[PDB]
Ligand binder design. Structure first.
Ligand SMILES: NC(=O)c1ccc(Oc2ccc3c(=O)[nH][nH]c(=O)c3c2)cc1
Ligand SMILES: NC(=O)c1ccc(Oc2ccc3c(=O)[nH][nH]c(=O)c3c2)cc1
Lengths: 198, 196
């Protein structure tokens, strides 16, 4: 069940693994980040190994891959948060019940950015007492999506005469998506934590 | 993976199966209800066969059995709701974001006694007087007393804030309700359609 690239946790359920600059795994994340935030500098990048979050996520992915039958359900997105949130996200993932109101709300859920530049804003990745900012890189089950609306507590139906058959997520703009909102637990796996500074 | 007492679904992932009155399964579920609701009239009982909800719930059960190092994590509880919520729950289960009082926290509420779920405030009568109550497998695990404004259960010791209780209750020594704060901690197993 657990990915073969992960470090041996030997009977442990959770581990943060520090990556090494020069490895393809560190460099692909650093490049995805610097593509839009070349003003900030990366302190470190940690791989999140959370067995339970991974299992529940992989079950949801397989279900959405079966339901949508077209396999393009997963995007790699960013999520800036405050230091006080990091230990909870590392252990328990993204909880919509803890989510702030977004300055442009497309629903009451957890928000993920396409561009690191938006997650790098102090309003999301709030600098801690030492000036460290925190951003997750996140596997998100975006699935089939539509433009959201501020009132949503779940994704809207695809068809108003079948109210229980839902979009998987919502976005700000279906043509040029810049954010995604997810409304269910285990729809997002926090894969890497980037610690960065001015 | 799919329980042996489920009936064939012709390669479908979702089915509501009406139970045969007077057989073992129906009698077991009826007696759980009539223990405290002997004055109500059962119109029908349906087995909820939702493969995806079941899979997600069984994963959380296996996770809680490991974390707690024992298999006493699951209880059978009741949840009354309005008819307009029934299709959603059948398909998607219980959702804290849908949300009656939330005195013990902002989660989904389950009753120990069917009589509490049978009150009209929960199992709201429809046009024709039909009321709806789910029988629910709930991962109550290790629980504590709730309070207003909880968004997750409390920590089992604030020296490790991320190691949480599984659920909260009104009274730890004699509970009558349980609150859970995560998707897939509750499987809706049977839908009882009844009248006063
Ligand atoms: N929690 C977060 O980190 C976060 C941050 C930003 C965010 O909304 C965005 C709003 C607008 C834009 C945009 O106009 N262009 N590109 C973007 O990526 C973007 C994201 C959602 C979530
Ligand atoms: N949506 C629901 O069905 C629902 C209904 C009621 C409910 O709280 C209860 C409150 C008090 C009591 C009690 O004093 N004795 N026995 C009970 O079972 C009980 C349950 C939770 C959930």
């Amino acid at each position: 069940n657990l990915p073969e690239h992960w470090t041996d946790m030997n009977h442990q359920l959770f581990c943060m693994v520090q990556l090494e600059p020069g490895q393809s795994e560190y460099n692909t994340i650093k490049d995805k980040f610097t593509r839009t935030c070349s003003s900030y500098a990366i302190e470190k990048i940690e791989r999140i190994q959370n067995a339970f979050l991974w299992q529940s996520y992989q079950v949801k992915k397989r279900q959405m891959d079966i339901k949508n039958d077209h396999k393009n359900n997963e995007r790699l997105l960013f999520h800036g948060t405050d230091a006080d949130s990091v230990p909870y996200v590392n252990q328990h993932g993204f909880n919509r019940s803890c989510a702030g109101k977004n300055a442009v709300s497309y629903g009451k859920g957890t928000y993920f950015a396409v561009d690191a530049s938006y997650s790098a804003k102090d309003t999301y990745s709030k600098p801690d007492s030492n000036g460290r900012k925190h951003m997750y890189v996140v596997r998100v089950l975006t699935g089939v999506f539509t433009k959201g609306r501020a009132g949503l507590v779940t994704p809207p139906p695809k068809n108003p005469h079948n109210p229980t058959d839902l979009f998987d997520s919502v976005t700000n703009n279906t043509r040029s998506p810049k954010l995604f909102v997810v409304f269910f637990d285990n729809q997002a796996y926090p894969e890497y934590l980037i610690t960065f500074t001015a």
